[PDB]
């Protein structure tokens with residue numbers, strides 16, 4: 186009755202969904218809460234719906250845990266997070282709205298401490314632990330989204346909240362004696378002028394040279410080398426920006442790396458439809474999982490008709506790149522279990538100027554794509570014009586049918602029978618200069634013809650990929666009907682989007698490997714795997 190729902194991602198079986206809340210692991214069992222509306226498909230009566238997992242793919246439902254049932258949140262149960270106590274106990278810090286509509290911070294512990302499901306959450310009476318008042322003085326309507334809490338070189342527990350002072354975005358921190366009495370720190374971990382409110386802030390360390398993530402309370406180790414990443418969801422831009430740096434424990438301030446603010450030149454986790462993103466430390470695999478919400482690119486009139494709004498992007502694994510100034514993301518390996526026992530392959534195939542070879546035997550609407558493009562003679566690449574600095578902007582000013590020396594060439598997913606409607610993520614190579622052997626790799630995700638219904642978020646997203654076009658260029662594509670996640674250079678580039686085709690659905694879907702550019706490129710290899718369904722609820 187509806188071909189726009191995902192088969193292996195995650196979403197409620199009905200109604201609106203928002204921010205990802207309190208992601209963690211306890212007794213080998215992962216947990217996921219989130220902003221959910223039990224009444225309709227439009228933001229409302231938000232509650233902390235629950236679900237659990239053993240492979241971050243299959244989810245078992247559970248009745249809402251944090252919902253309005255006390256003064257301190259009688260008007261709403263906003264986003265929060267869960268900290269792992271130095272004994273294995275998992276609590277929660279969430280923003281509730283009290284009887285006089287003002288963002289207060291409340292804490293919540295579990296009931297049956299032995300229950301591996303933690304379905305019943307107990308909410309302290311001392312709540313709220315933190316609230317905007319006459320002394321702290323802050324926009325009571327702009328003090329929410331508390332992060333996970335990290336100890337320190339002492340007993341002092343630290344955490345930050347997202348606020349704003351006259352357009353001055355920041356992260357208010359509160360030191361805690363023993364996770365009960367919280368003192369309002371007289372200085373934000375950081376802040377940035379210009380950018381509005383700071384939402385869904387997240388603060389966590391990353392080892393420099395290591396794939397597996399680091400704990401949340403790790404401090405100055407003489408053997409291991411740590412770095413820090415503060416990410417915050419912006420308001421007036423609806424994107425996610427992070428930044429890497431150091432953390433002077435003295436002034437409890439965050440110091441980004443060599444000239445890098447949180448807005449202006451700040452990198453995005455995802456250069457497409459991403460939001461409310463948040464991480465969490467996996468004790469079991471020693472990795473850091475990254476959750477992201479991702480709006481609904483369909484008109485609301487649709488969310489009301491289809492009965493649902495909001496999907497959750499596949500948990501990603503992030504970590505610092507070798508260069509040290511960019512996070513590397515790549516979906517959880519355990520998801521490749523939904524891959525059909527079969528295997529669609531294609532190796533050593535030429536892509537003549539403006540050619541395209543179809544990928545046949547595969548659920549074109551629910552698969553895992555993956556290509557390795559090879560570019561010969563990089564010299565044929567064009568030299569970028571000055572102005573072209575914003576990735577997104579270039580991909581929007583130069584659609585798919587506009588040729589380039591090296592490009593455009595990538596994938597066409599959920600493509601229609603004869604291309605009346607298709608999606609096209611691809612690459613374009615240019616020279617940074619002319620003789621200073623340095624190239625720029627453009628990753629574009631065109632949405633202009635993603636569907637036939639003019640009423641959809643057709644905005645195209647753009648991004649740059651820090652890879653060396655000397656070797657082959659990678660590009661993966663998770664395919665799941667309405668949602669498509671793009672990955673370039675092994676995650677180095679993550680552009681996700683939402684499509685709603687009228688002809689490209691179910692068994693009527695097609696895939697396509699193209700190259701409509703001048704110079705012809707080669708397909709060193711390409712594997713498309715059909716993807717079975719995941720038990721979501």
Ligand SMILES: OC[C@H]1O[C@@](CO)(O[C@H]2O[C@H](CO)[C@@H](O)[C@H](O)[C@H]2O)[C@@H](O)[C@@H]1O
Pocket residue numbers: 203204220231262263264329330384385418420461
């Ligand atoms: O409880 C809502 C929950 O969502 C967030 C996500 O960033 O709120 C933002 O998005 C809303 C929908 O566009 C806006 O109305 C709201 O003003 C904005 O902050 C979280 O901040 C919040 O916890």
Ligand SMILES: *[C@@H]1O[C@H](CO)[C@@H](O)[C@H](O)[C@H]1NC(C)=O
Pocket residue numbers: 296297298299300
């Ligand atoms: C509730 O928690 C208690 C912890 O003492 C546990 O003994 C009990 O099994 C739980 N409830 C049940 C029976 O599921």
Ligand SMILES: *[C@@H]1O[C@H](CO)[C@@H](O)[C@H](O)[C@H]1NC(C)=O
Pocket residue numbers: 324325326327349382
């Ligand atoms: C800040 O607070 C004032 C009064 O509480 C409110 O009118 C204003 O909208 C707030 N600014 C925003 C949008 O964060």
Ligand SMILES: *[C@@H]1O[C@H](CO)[C@@H](O)[C@H](O)[C@H]1NC(C)=O
Pocket residue numbers: 422423480481482483484485642
């Ligand atoms: C959020 O989703 C809406 C549709 O509900 C879309 O139009 C918009 O581009 C997305 N982000 C914003 C507010 O720009």
